[PDB]
């Protein structure tokens, strides 16, 4: 639902209003109806309810960095001139109500009406097509309401204390309605521990396997030791969903909605998030969360901390004046000191504050904010930046409660102005990378269900150690989750615990964790043996729907968006006009990512083992020599011109603190020998077209993880499959492939295997690793070619070869003015 004004719908829908006015004999013409609708007469207001019904409208807000920035809504006609927007669609849109505007588009053709009703409707896009996470989930007010409802307050009106045989129990209730009664009188708190008898609330499993042996049926009573708020919460979740009995921190609500989409339809999840909306709005008003200058408290150790640290900051300048220290190094020291102080203040401040405080409650509930802001407000602002971007070693010891002096305010303005441009240049960088990714991709549509292959990549699912239990890998919701299995999974015995073709998930992974497996072979697009694109079973399922992906689904654009959108959360190259190359230090954000996606040679390169075996290490002055001796073969290999600033590898096995690569060790093939990066071209000539893809995926995700960005690896898999899709030839074989020319690998196979007559020698070409830039120029159409330069070479080469345009990459169907061969515009569905 979306609220639409009566003067902003009248225009959009004007022709239909004319039609209706003329069928109901209000207007005898289309000219009189046009006039009537221009003069806004009293009769064009009834009509506009019979036509605005069941007709969706698309709402958009720019910049649009992903598809949820356009959503379909059912119009509800409202008096006013502003658009009413559900508060759960506002995190995708990135919208707020400080003035922000929004655009409205209207479809006309049945096909587009249905695409809106089905693909775009907000009650279907509950999840991100990038991690599977829900977006339309309770935000700040809802969160604090549900966190106050479900919390536990010792010493609350009506609690349970067992009464020590004076009266038996003193706090037990035969139902939730009796507890409501007791709450109205004032005899019970909604946050007090009680024992209730529940019949329409399915219990948990730990107790359901202990109080019911044939399946808990609604009406089968049980007893719950919990609060009334947790009850009323669970009374919003679906019927068969168990009892949670937990403080509804944001992560809990996320978890629960994830489980609900795993185990239920999506209409149910929509209804449920609306229920939670209503309830959190209710219990935020009645949560007592407000602001005063007495709800903003200051720890009394602050001054002791600051004196104890001024001692140090004085001893430093003392040494500086003694000559023991330079000025820049003195500033570095002081900044290291006034960083170990704001830390102690934040510590003492999250300690001193109670839990019933609103300023801490709104934070620890996940509704908004951080403890950094709470320290800045009630503690100390701390250090601030110059316009160079360096640190002023004189900190701001004052809070925005004490009030800042004139100098402190002035020097905060410096970095307060330097944040309005950054927030803009970062968008241009992100846009650059996103356009690159959308250029190489945009032709990775799903075309066939199953490639019918048994290839795949291995994924670790857990790791144990000196203990018994298995520690589950922290990279499961992006590597193995939402995949398809290639091999039936088996334990030591030999039976199948999870079978082929199974779409992994939370249940499946918890199972495989209960039986103790620590590796599983999974299908990916890095291996899908499909000519045009990828197969569903190799891609997997869609993170938005949670069901296996469909045929025709553009999965490259999704990848580009998912990777580019968070490009502003990443470090970048300094924005200063001129200076020294800051690459002297390490810079591993967007630079590393552009590097990898173009496949250029890393800066802090390190050599990799050409052959397994052992190592012999020698050191001259500033030069490292390394000689690998093979264990089985011979012809020891060597790397000599190895810089000594470049540090050796650090191994760090479980027990031994091996660390530095040593003389008398073992190096496998692919082992990086120096701390740094590897050249994907070396990794390729050593290992092949399946390991380099994995090194690239792993490095890109390393980057996007160190910055706190979660992306499912299959998007990187798409982007990398579109980087290793061609071969260079030196032998044509029986096949006629000009030796010295690049060609595809699927064409390679087709033309070099079908030859059973004349097949005296197959074709022969080796693979080439390229970057998305080149890889986007290697297209195989003469319309996307002419789209670029060099139209004449192309048109001639193609007219002499009497080629044909298959119209797949969809970059050319817009030129022609034709449907895109994706989703709803492919023959299967067209």
């Amino acid at each position: 639902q979306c609220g639409l004004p009566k003067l902003m719908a009248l225009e959009l829908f004007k022709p239909f209003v004319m039609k209706r006015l003329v069928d109901l004999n209000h207007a005898q013409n289309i000219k009189s109806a046009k006039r009537m609708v221009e003069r806004q007469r009293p009769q064009v207001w009834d009509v506009l309810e019979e036509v605005i019904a069941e007709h969706p409208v698309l709402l958009n807000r720019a910049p649009t960095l992903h598809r949820l920035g356009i959503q379909a809504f059912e119009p509800q006609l409202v008096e006013g001139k502003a658009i009413q927007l559900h508060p759960l669609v506002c995190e995708a849109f990135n919208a707020d109500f400080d003035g922000d505007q929004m655009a409205v588009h209207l479809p006309l053709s049945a096909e587009a009406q249905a695409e809106a009703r089905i693909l775009m409707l907000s009650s279907n896009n509950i999840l991100s097509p990038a991690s599977g996470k829900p977006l339309a989930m309770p935000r700040l007010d809802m969160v604090t309401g549900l966190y106050y409802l479900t919390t536990l307050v010792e010493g609350a009106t009506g609690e349970y204390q067992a009464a020590t045989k004076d009266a038996p129990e003193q706090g037990v209730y035969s139902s939730p309605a009796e507890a409501i009664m007791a709450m109205d009188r004032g005899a019970l708190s909604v946050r007090a521990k009680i024992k209730v008898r529940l019949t329409e609330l399915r219990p948990p499993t730990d107790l359901e396997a202990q109080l019911f042996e044939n399946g808990w049926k609604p009406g089968d009573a049980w007893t719950a030791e919990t609060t009334l708020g947790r009850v009323m919460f669970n009374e919003l979740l679906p019927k068969s969903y168990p009892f949670v009995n937990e403080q509804m921190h944001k992560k809990v609500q996320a978890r629960i909605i994830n489980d609900l989409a795993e185990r239920f339809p999506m209409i149910v999840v929509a209804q449920t998030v609306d229920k939670l909306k209503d309830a959190g709005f209710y219990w935020a008003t009645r949560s007592g969360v407000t602001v005063s200058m007495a709800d903003v408290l200051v720890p009394p150790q602050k001054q002791e901390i600051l004196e104890r640290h001024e001692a140090e900051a004085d001893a430093i300048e003392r040494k500086y004046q003694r000559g023991a220290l330079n000025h820049t190094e003195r500033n570095e020291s002081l900044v290291k000191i006034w960083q170990d102080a704001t830390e102690e203040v934040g510590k003492a401040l999250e300690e001193f504050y109670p839990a019933d405080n609103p300023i801490i409650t709104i934070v620890k509930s996940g509704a908004t904010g951080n403890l950094t802001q709470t320290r800045t407000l009630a503690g100390m602002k701390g250090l601030v930046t110059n316009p160079k971007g360096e640190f002023i070693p004189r900190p701001i010891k004052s809070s925005f409660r004490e009030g800042l002096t004139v100098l402190e305010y002035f020097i905060n303005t410096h970095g307060a102005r330097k944040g309005l441009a950054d927030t803009a240049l970062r968008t241009a960088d992100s846009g650059y990378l996103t356009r690159r990714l959308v250029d190489v991709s945009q032709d990775v549509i799903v075309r066939e269900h199953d490639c019918e292959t048994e290839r795949g990549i291995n994924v670790t699912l857990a790791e144990r150690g000196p203990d018994g239990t298995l520690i589950r890998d922290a990279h499961v919701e992006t590597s193995a989750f939402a995949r398809t299995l290639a091999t039936d999974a088996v334990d030591a015995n030999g039976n199948v615990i999870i079978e082929r073709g199974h779409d992994l998930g939370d249940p499946a992974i918890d199972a495989l964790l209960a039986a103790g497996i620590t590796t599983v072979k999974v299908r990916s697009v890095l291996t899908c043996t499909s000519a045009t694109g990828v197969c569903a079973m190799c891609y997997g399922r869609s993170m938005a729907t949670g069901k296996l992906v469909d045929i025709g689904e553009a999965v490259g654009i999704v990848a580009a968006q998912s990777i580019g959108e968070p490009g502003t959360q990443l470090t970048m190259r300094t924005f200063h006009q001129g200076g020294v190359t800051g690459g002297a230090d390490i810079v591993g954000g967007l630079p590393r990512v552009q590097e990898l996606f173009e496949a250029r040679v890393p800066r802090n390169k390190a050599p990799i083992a050409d052959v397994a075996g052992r190592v012999r290490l020698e050191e001259s002055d500033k030069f490292f020599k390394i000689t690998i001796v093979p264990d089985d073969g011979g012809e020891e290999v060597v790397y000599d011109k190895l810089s000594k600033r470049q540090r050796l590898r650090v191994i760090t096995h479980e027990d031994g603190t091996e660390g530095v690569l040593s003389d008398g060790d073992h190096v496998e093939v692919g082992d990086q020998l120096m701390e740094g990066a590897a050249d994907p071209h070396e990794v390729l000539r050593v290992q092949g077209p399946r390991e380099v893809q994995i090194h690239l995926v792993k490095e890109v995700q390393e980057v996007y993880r160190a910055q706190g960005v979660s992306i499912h690896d299959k998007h990187i898999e798409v982007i990398v499959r579109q980087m290793l899709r061609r071969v260079t030839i030196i032998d044509s074989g029986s096949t006629e492939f000009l030796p010295g020319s690049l060609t595809e690998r699927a064409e390679f196979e087709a033309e070099n295997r079908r030859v059973v007559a004349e097949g005296g020698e197959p074709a022969a070409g080796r693979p080439v690793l390229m970057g998305i830039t080149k890889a986007s120029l290697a297209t195989d159409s003469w319309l996307s070619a002419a789209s670029f330069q060099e139209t004449t070479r192309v048109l001639t080469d193609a007219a002499i070869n009497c080629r044909s345009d298959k119209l797949n990459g969809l970059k050319e169907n817009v030129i022609i003015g034709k449907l895109i061969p994706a989703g709803t515009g492919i023959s299967r569905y067209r």
Binding site: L325, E329, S333, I586
Partner: protein, 57 residues
Amino acid sequence: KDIARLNVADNGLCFGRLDTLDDARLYIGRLGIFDRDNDFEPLLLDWRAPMARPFYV
């Protein structure tokens, strides 16, 4: 910046002692190392420091 500097300094930290006319050992290297507890008393001077001068002049 700090890390990079440390990584570099791993190679040949101390260049040499200076034994003064008052038995004040001054080790000279390529990084400042002070005792955060003992009045920031320097354990290793930087080669760019005014009291690292009587190693070059």
